[PDB]
Amino acid sequence: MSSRYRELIAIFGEFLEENDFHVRISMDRVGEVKTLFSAKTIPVESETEAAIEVVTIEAARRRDALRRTCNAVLRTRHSDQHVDVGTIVADEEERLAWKFLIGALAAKNSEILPVVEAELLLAAVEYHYATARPELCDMFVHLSASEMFFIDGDSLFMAALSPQSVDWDLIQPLHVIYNAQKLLYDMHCRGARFHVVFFDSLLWIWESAPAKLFMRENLRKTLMSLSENDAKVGLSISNFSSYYSEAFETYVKQWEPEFILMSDGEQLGRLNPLQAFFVRPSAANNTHDSRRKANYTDADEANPYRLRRQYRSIVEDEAVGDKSDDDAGGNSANNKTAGAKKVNKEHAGQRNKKERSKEDEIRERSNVIAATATVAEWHKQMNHLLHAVDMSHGRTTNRDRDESINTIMAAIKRLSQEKFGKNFDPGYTLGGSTNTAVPLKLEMWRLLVAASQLREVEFAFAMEDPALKDSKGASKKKDSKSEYKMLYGFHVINQFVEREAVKGNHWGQLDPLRKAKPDMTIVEARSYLRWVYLSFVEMHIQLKLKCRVVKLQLENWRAERERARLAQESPKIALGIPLFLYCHHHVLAVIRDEGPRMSSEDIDTVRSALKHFDLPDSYYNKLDQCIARWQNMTLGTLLPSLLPQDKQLFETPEMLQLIHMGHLLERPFVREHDYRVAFNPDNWQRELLDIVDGRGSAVVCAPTSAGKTFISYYCMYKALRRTNKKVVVYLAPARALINQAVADVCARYGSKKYKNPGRYIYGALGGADYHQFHDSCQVLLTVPETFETMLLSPKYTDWVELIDYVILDEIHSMESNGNGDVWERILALLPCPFVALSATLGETQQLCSWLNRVQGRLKEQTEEMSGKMRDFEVHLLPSEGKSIQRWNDIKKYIYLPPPGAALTQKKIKAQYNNCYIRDLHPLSILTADQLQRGFPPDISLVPSEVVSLFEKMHSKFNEVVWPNYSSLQLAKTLRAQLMLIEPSKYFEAETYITQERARQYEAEVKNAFAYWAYLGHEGCELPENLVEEDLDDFSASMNMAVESILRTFAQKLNEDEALLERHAADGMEKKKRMLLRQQHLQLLQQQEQENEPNQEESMEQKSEEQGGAQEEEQEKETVGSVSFPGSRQFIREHILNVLRELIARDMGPTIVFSFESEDCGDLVKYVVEQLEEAESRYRKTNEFALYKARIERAAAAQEARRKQRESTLKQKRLTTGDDGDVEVADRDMSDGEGEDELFVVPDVLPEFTFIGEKCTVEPEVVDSLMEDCEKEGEDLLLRALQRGIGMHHAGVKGKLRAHVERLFRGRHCGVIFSTETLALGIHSPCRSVVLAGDHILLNPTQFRQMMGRAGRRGLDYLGHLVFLGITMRRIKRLMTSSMTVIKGNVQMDPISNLRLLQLYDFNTLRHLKNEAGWKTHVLKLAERLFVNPLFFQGRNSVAGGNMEGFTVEWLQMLLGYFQREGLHFSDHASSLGSILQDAMYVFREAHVGNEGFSFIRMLTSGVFDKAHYSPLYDKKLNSGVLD
């Protein structure tokens, strides 16, 4: 204590004038010191914001750095002999150390500068390397790689020469370079990179030990790759130099966006040569792009590094370099607890979320086989019956056909009051109230059609397809009128007439042939014929009301074009489109249908509008013509164009067809499909269903919005409807937890009754419901591990055989970010037909082979009986294709504020963009990318992507004329394609609108674009020239050709992708660097103000030295001090404003994605803050004073009327006698009870456009959910929720979080803040998707779940993904990447094989008989396991291929290692144990061959005959650690 603080002063004063300690008593010029440190290195003060936090943020982790810079300065400022002495400050020696400094700084003012500045710039680069703790990632695989990756070789060489950590193996006499080859052959072989290696050198700095052992490898790999190929040689390398140094490597580094792999440091130090000149690149990188650094650790695959932490800018200098618990709880405490709670389980799940509809379920009980008999027990002639049976129970005819006709009454009565309507007068618009009406009315009579305008007569069969037609046209042709039907409706009498006629055969022999004759004029002959009259009443009734829409759309669309024609241009066709698409929707009905005239109705109305709408003739004759076949069964021909019947043009900048294509998003989607069992839905089902109806395997790819999961509950429909005794199973995306709520909710579209326990669903292990209820039920819901144990697991075997049928979710999403071993196990083993669920998988074939294989192996094992029928595995893509990414397009447009703005913003105010969302147009459309990648995901959309791109492509690959497309047939090889892409884009579904088949154009024109790129920017490498067949390939003009189309790429391309994330992204960083530098113009100048020249013994200024310098901007504020792009909590300031403007472009619900957990809470908090603020800014007597006035005044008056009536009623008194004249009290009591008139002060306007506009759910329950939360209040969810801020994150109770989710789906709330889970095993409606940060992890894996999100189910036309969007480039590295592709793991695992061992040897324990059954089950099991054998990455390991057996060399080593081991249990004295010798009594007889050569079942037979037994105790207790 004392002694050490007597010491340190005596070291100091020797250097320079004695005492610091009292020369001066303070100083106090601290102020000099503190400037000098921080303006380089960080650590001086414990920097305080509002407050320092827990004071181990900057006690512990500060005082390292603080007393580092302290010591390492003073030791260097002790020079004049020694830098050989250490200076270490204690506590009270901090102040001392500073007094020692300040009185040395102003002592000389020359020597001081280098010994500080240099020491600083050294130590800074030391700390920058040390900035750190590290990460553990993981493996290599995730970011290793698409794309441009480098490793600079110097590093490469030292990676081979790296090891102790095992002294180097294999005796070789300095041929070592095999190392390089090995690593190359690892990560190209089963990875991508696109790899580049620099050799960035002479770095070296060798000898530190005799070398080199350099240029050997340099010249080697040079020669290898520049052979040109050899299939072992390629990577590829460049030259350069100049050492490290940038101003060389810049031009490269920019152009091909990458990330980096490099080796600072072990050891071998020496000091300055290594650490210095490697570290400083790292800094450089981070203050360019920013890129990031890895490695030199122990890769292949996973390593270190460092990231996404904020940098010190600038700081540089090159100047080195240099030349029982399931049981007993059911007994003790079960006196009354209370009396069971379980009643609080079932109830919860049975009130749980409502969303979707139904198909048939009722209680069933029976086991069904088919056979019927007389059971009377004869009749045995027909003359023993004569006449047999008659009408009775015929009341099912009587009433039902009365009711039928009573429809046509009501229908045409409702028609009456409508048809005349508000009869039209030219010109008034929009007026016209009944514009609204007919659209509603239409929907009504569509809802109604099922069972009270069509059948009470069965349908029946739905026949074969033409039957509906040919039995219709007949009926009309007997009746005098062309279109029979509605006017004078009811005509079921002349039906009966006709039906009796045509005697021999009743209806003539055509139709009863195809029906396989049922009833002659009895049941079926009536039931059918009825229903085909009758659909065609309903049909024509509606069809007329569709006419009446497109009819009066004429009028509303008149002045819409014409008034605005004068304006500048001639519109509306960007708003005039619904005319056309309505006229489409109308005539869309005809698909089987008899025309409803053309002399009144449909066609006449359509025609008048259509030639008025601009369309010159030619389009005319395509209309009637094609549809003529459809019409006919009815109609004649066509009017001439002559004789008033056309109208004014806009046309030609358009032409006909084009008018559609430019303006609109969204097309039909025609049903017709399956009508007994159905949804309808939209083809995918019409394939999928037929598999499960077999029984089988398969999987469905489906890129999301995807529809995937819900279609699996045909399994549950089968096992429930019919002989319920078999389990259906749904296996989760796993634990935690997300599966559970959805799984539960689905299955409770229809519970079902039983006898004594019985019971419907058991779950678990979880994170809800939680461990047990295990067993009894029909259908299950667990996770991989739970199910596994339940299988092997020897007492649960009973269950296994009763499982038909097992489906398990997600697929791709789990495969990547898991845990993608456990999967393989459960598709190798034991009964099922399976459905399985995946979004996109880029490798086809590879998947399907593995599957189909292991199906055939199951079939094999079940022999000789085989299966009942199926195996086989099917594999649904089957290809245009795409599923519900065809359904709607998703625009991506991204966040970037205009540099320099205000913030807060808020409400009841003018607004525009401003908003940071802008446009985008997908990042990169390029020359270089297209060569390799041509043309990658994610892109699709039309129109306005590839539409006007055509106009470019078609004007400049054809107008070349003709400079080197003339060698060889190149020019025509292109022009044979180009021209033809235009008709194929339209005339798939000509006449009205293309199907949805404007999609197909994208794939068409992908043959245009990518093909050119496979000529390209590169020479003869692609297409690869010399091969005889003609495109090129035998042109030496290939080079020329390549560079003719090189020109023809760039010119058109870069206009469209218009560089938003470059332009103002650099603007923001420009602002950042005018912001940061203004901080150094504060402190520098301020140091002179702190002392002031109101002081000091030098010439007076009287404080004319004050303020900043020297090129001057008004002092430091922008969008904030801390603007600070790509940084955290940047973000929040603008997120409020993003939101508010998305409500005031989009209108839908809004999800916000983030990383869970502290972060998500910080976000929520800040927004609640802002709103509470703005409420304080309304209530303080601005507009508010006026508002409250009214509401207060009128309330008074209300409650005074209460007292008014209370007076006049309280009279006093009827008097008509005496002399008072007439009066009777109380005669007026007609008024009245009134409520509530208002009072508000919780919240008004600033929160009321923040939360959703339109909503649902009666207020009672909403309030009561809030009420619950309030009691146990966690986050103060009670505050956040009611202010519109949804949440869903960890650290929230199950009851509370559950309340949130209902109210987002209920469309009560407007926003929600949560993590990535809500796109996975939970679901919500979305429209504007918001993403906060690109940190700390993304793969295109967990991107593409949220990518296709929005475009809601039958609702929204557009998804919107707004990115934040921290980095500059990484948009590209999400989008432009091709595909998340399978690449699994296994069985080879020790633990698996130990489990299998002990399973077999448990039945070996006392009690054999069943030995037979057991062992042959073990044979089957042994085959079933190791099914291929050998799965995915295991053939890239040590086997090759597909090999196995292979258990032998492991087995034997483990065999004499199981039980030798001392007392075992534990270290306590014998007995327990004394057995330690059992593993020598099985070794010799298992090493006969080593057991002992090829073929599966000789392995396990060899292992029938171990023992392989522990002392009992140990190996059991291994197996029971795991479970």
Ligand SMILES: Nc1ncnc2c1ncn2[C@@H]1O[C@H](COP(=O)(O)OP(=O)(O)O)[C@@H](O)[C@H]1O
């Ligand atoms: N064939 C269909 N036609 C129209 N809407 C459908 C159809 N099938 C499903 N939907 C709807 O779309 C919604 C989203 O589909 P969904 O199956 O939940 O998602 P996922 O792709 O995650 O499996 C469902 O909630 C349902 O409303």
Ligand SMILES: [Mg+2]
């Ligand atoms: Mg799903």
